[PDB]
Ligand binder design. Structure first.
Ligand code: VO4
Length: 157
């Protein structure tokens, strides 16, 4: 068994609600496809405000309902991420404006930066911040990341 090693970094503002859901989902997919050894996956924040914190409790329990677990600590996106990751996928256009800005700060930017939702077969471009929502909104977010990541993998696979 042999292919190339591919890398994806999932990005949100805080790296507490959404990017850990999208990251964990994506890991479960790869693991389920027997393709983990070919993938490098991680999640990070635009902001430094929550570095080191654990994922929201609502994200945590939501992933559990689906039999998924995570051990992520929040970390900030850095300049080297633009040189090391094949893909940076974010949640919203704000995340997107911010990364492009920072990427400029890099000379040799090899990362393709895009909205995760741009992969959604249902076309919901945007993945809403569920922080102030309740438990059904987290379930809605999980659902979108599932759609998107399944579609992302299948074309980069
Ligand atoms: O942790 V995030 O989804 O930015 O809230």
């Amino acid at each position: 068994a042999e292919q190339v090693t591919k890398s994806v970094l999932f990005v949100c503002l805080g790296n507490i609600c959404r990017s850990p859901i999208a990251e964990a989902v994506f890991r479960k997919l790869v693991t389920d496809q027997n393709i983990s050894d070919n993938w490098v996956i991680d999640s990070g924040a635009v902001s430094d405000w929550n570095v080191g914190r654990s994922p929201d409790p609502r994200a945590v329990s939501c992933l559990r309902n689906h039999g998924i677990n995570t051990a992520h600590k929040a970390r900030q996106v850095t300049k080297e991420d633009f040189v090391t990751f094949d893909y940076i996928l974010c949640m919203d256009e704000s995340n997107l404006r911010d990364l492009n800005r920072k990427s400029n700060q890099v000379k040799n930017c090899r990362a393709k930066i895009e909205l995760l939702g741009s992969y959604d077969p249902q076309k919901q471009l945007i993945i809403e911040d569920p922080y102030y929502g309740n438990d059904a909104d987290f379930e809605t977010v999980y659902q979108q990341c599932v759609r998107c990541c399944r579609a992302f993998l299948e074309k980069v696979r």
